[PDB]
């Protein structure tokens, strides 16, 4: 059972953007589908719902006449068409599954799509090593100057998770984001083990692997 | 709509504690209430439905009570991974579907001093004409900490930014990064770069430094 979302990124104010959610692992045509959004640091806000057959749709008043929800039960997809977007629409958008019992509740959620309302252009990041030097050592990767959020960082293709800290991005004065991802490792492991940071910035389709050495 | 009010707004509790949070509906919703848990950086998870019925797979330490307009969620044995935000949600009426404002949960643990590391800018970055110096404060508690930069013993202002992680779901600590950004010309104009750290777990301020080159 899985819901996979897509379509995030930058959108200028007043312009349009389309979100999509693909289902797999369950009888999709038997479930109603919600969209829920979450502004940075804020709570969950319901946006829209569509019935299993697609005959009924409902909308939050703030998006009425602005958003349109639809589904295709042959392609197992739900879509959220978002028009004349506003700064208040900048948020993480989830699609979520539901079934009539009364709507039971959202028991399966998509991983979310980040929508940023801005006139700023999309830029891919550059990745610089945070080299370990002089029992526990620290190393990392500096992910600098990208737009919009988010970027994801893993280490050694996900084989290294313990002691990993990926910091929330900060907005620089240039209007670009930057973050760091660090890992603590035994100092005796330096020059003996390979450490590679894997950086992904889907909006700019930028994929970077950076080996970090002493 | 049906307004959902949650209390408290946030709380701090110890591992193993019995903690209770409250949800209140603006009108009678019988037992048509869901509870969700959202861990830091994760999607919301449905904990229970019909006010008191646990979803399959949900840990037994979670229990819900109440009917009409007043509800509670209780955790009988708080675990490090129970941090994050809890939301109630009514399904007595739609549209609109409404969530409560959420209750934030933090773990109170023993004081832990930060491990401090300093990273000089990479040669690769210097090629671009910018230098980023990074100071790392790792696995400390509580969240409060101060970081100050010193360049040739000169106190720096307005040229650094900080980022702090959410509380760790395993050891309940925080980590912090401070990044000093300078032009290449300014960076090579000075020799000694230091970041000074103050924290409850430290008897004296800790300073880490390096010399350019």
Numbering used by the authors:
A (entry chain H): 2 to 52, 52A, 53 to 82, 82A, 82B, 82C, 83 to 98, 100B, ...
B (entry chain L): 1 to 95, 95A, 96 to 212
What did the paper state?
RSV F is a class I fusion protein that is initially synthesized as an inactive precursor. To facilitate virus entry, the mature F protein is triggered to undergo a transition from a metastable prefusion conformation to a stable postfusion conformation, resulting in fusion of the viral and host-cell membranes.
To identify the epitope on prefusion RSV F recognized by AM14, the crystal structure of AM14 alone and in complex with prefusion F was determined. AM14 potently neutralized all RSV strains tested, with IC50s of 13.6 ng/ml for strain A Long, 12.4 ng/ml for strain A2, 30.8 ng/ml for subtype B strain 18537 and 4.6 ng/ml for subtype B strain 9320. Collectively, these results demonstrate that AM14 is a potent neutralizer of RSV infection, capable of neutralizing both A and B subtypes equally well by a mechanism independent of viral attachment to the cell surface. In this experiment, AM14 bound tightly to prefusion RSV F derived from A and B subtypes with EC50s of 0.63 nM and 0.18 nM, respectively. Therefore, although AM14 binds specifically to prefusion RSV F with sub-nanomolar affinity, its kinetics are much faster than those of other potent antibodies such as D25.
